Structures are given as C-alpha cells and as structure tokens.
C-alpha cells in the first residue's frame, strides 16, 4: 500500500495486504429501523380467564411436590434438633456430680487422655497447691472417661495459678496429651 500509517516499514506493511473489497449483496433481512419483536401482544383476557375453566376441570388436582418434601424434612429436622437442645438446657446445684465445694476454687481440666489416671492428675494438679476435692467426668451410659474433670482446691488463688500456669502454656502435658485448663465456667 502507498501510505501505510503504521509502525512497520514499507516491506512489512505491504506484506499485510488485505483481500479485495467485499462484493455488494442486497440485504435479505429487515432493516434495523424496521426491526422489532411481535407487537400488539394480546393481554390475558377475561375471555382467557373464561377459557381457564376448561383447563381447571381437566386437571383439578396438581401433582404432589416431592422435591419440596426433601427440604421440609431437613427444616423440621432442625426444629427437632432445637427441641433436643431444649431438653438438655433445662438440666449446677442439683447435678451433684457437680455439687462439690465452692466454685471459686473449682478448676476445670479438659482434653485429658481417656486412659489417664487419678494419681497422675493428682500430681499435676497438686503441683500448684493442695487438692480439696476431685471429680472426673464419665458418661452416664457407661464408665468411659469424657476427658474433662473438676478439681476443687484449698484456695482460689492456687486454682487461678493452676489455670494460668497449666492452661496458659501449650496446655499441661499429661500422659501423651496436652490438657487445656480454665475456670469452672458453670
């Protein structure tokens, strides 16, 4: 081409030569100004609602929705979960596995191994002070240890020292497990 207004030099520009001009074909379609979708849509008639009854008497009862029952199953199931949680929430001065002495001296151990023993926990808990009472949480249906316990100590200051020392660092190592520690929380 002659001018080639481009980055390329003359030899590269003449290499990009386009195909010859497109031949003219008369349009077979509707001009853009004439283009529209179907106008004068007949609205929904009183005569259409009058013809509704032929459809209504033929199919009076719709097919049941069994894909909605899958959702009505799970939501009702959630409501029943909330009801069981309601059964648990109504149930610490009664419990008397928890009726041991003043809660200010009650220190809670958790994540203890289920194979653990009362002597070792008496030593690890006895490290921070003298032990007043001790109670280990076991399931009611069977004696398997739940992994948590409550230790009443002679003074609340020693119980707080045990919570901070034992519970504030890594958890206190007991048997093969790291055991978290906190206050009674109940």
């Amino acid at each position: 081409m002659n001018y080639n207004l481009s980055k390329y030099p003359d030899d590269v520009s003449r290499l990009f030569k386009p195909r010859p001009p497109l031949s003219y074909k008369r349009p077979t379609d509707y001009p853009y100004a004439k283009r529209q979708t179907n106008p004068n849509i007949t609205g929904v008639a009183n005569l259409l609602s009058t013809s509704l009854k032929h459809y209504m008497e033929e199919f009076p009862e719709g097919s049941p929705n069994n894909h909605l029952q899958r959702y009505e199953d799970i939501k009702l199931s959630k409501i029943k979960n909330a009801q069981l949680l309601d059964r648990r929430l109504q149930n610490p001065n009664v419990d008397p596995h928890i009726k041991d002495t003043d809660p200010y001296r009650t220190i809670f151990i958790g994540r203890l191994p289920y194979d653990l023993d009362e002597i070792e926990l008496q030593k690890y808990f006895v490290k921070f002070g003298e032990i007043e009472k001790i109670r280990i949480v076991k399931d009611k249906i069977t004696q398997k240890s739940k992994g948590y316990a409550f230790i009443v100590f002679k003074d609340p200051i020693s119980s707080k020292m045990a919570f901070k020392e034992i519970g504030v660092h890594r958890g206190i190592q007991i048997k093969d497990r790291i055991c978290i520690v906190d206050i009674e929380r109940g």
Binding site: A33, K34, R35
Partner: protein, 75 residues
Amino acid sequence: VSTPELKKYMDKKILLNINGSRKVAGILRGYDIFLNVVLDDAMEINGEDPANNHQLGLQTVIRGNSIISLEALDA
C-alpha cells in the same frame, strides 16, 4: 470497565446515526463508559439539508445503546 476513547473527538462537530434511520450532528461535549454522548447545538439531518433539518436543543444527551457509528466531520 474501560472508558471509550473519544479524546480526539471532543469539541469537534460530529455526525452520528441514531438507530437505523436518524442522523444527528452536534459538537461533542462529553461521554461515559456506556458511550452516552452529550453534545450541544444539536441538529437532526434529513434529506433536504436546509429545509427538513431542525435543531433540537442547547444541550442534548444520547444513550449509548442507540449509537451505531460515530464520524467526526472535522480535523
């Protein structure tokens, strides 16, 4: 996302075709990302140049959806 580049066009008298039939000529003022183009001293071109041509308003704005091609008759 990206603004159309009319930057060389603005303030120059420009003809642009509204929809299929119409052709409007005016001095381009501003534009946006949808190519909505506002221009002043608008005139609607028709077959008879002095006769059927009638001005629109002091300021006219155009929806970018009805814009087909935009030619500047100017430098």
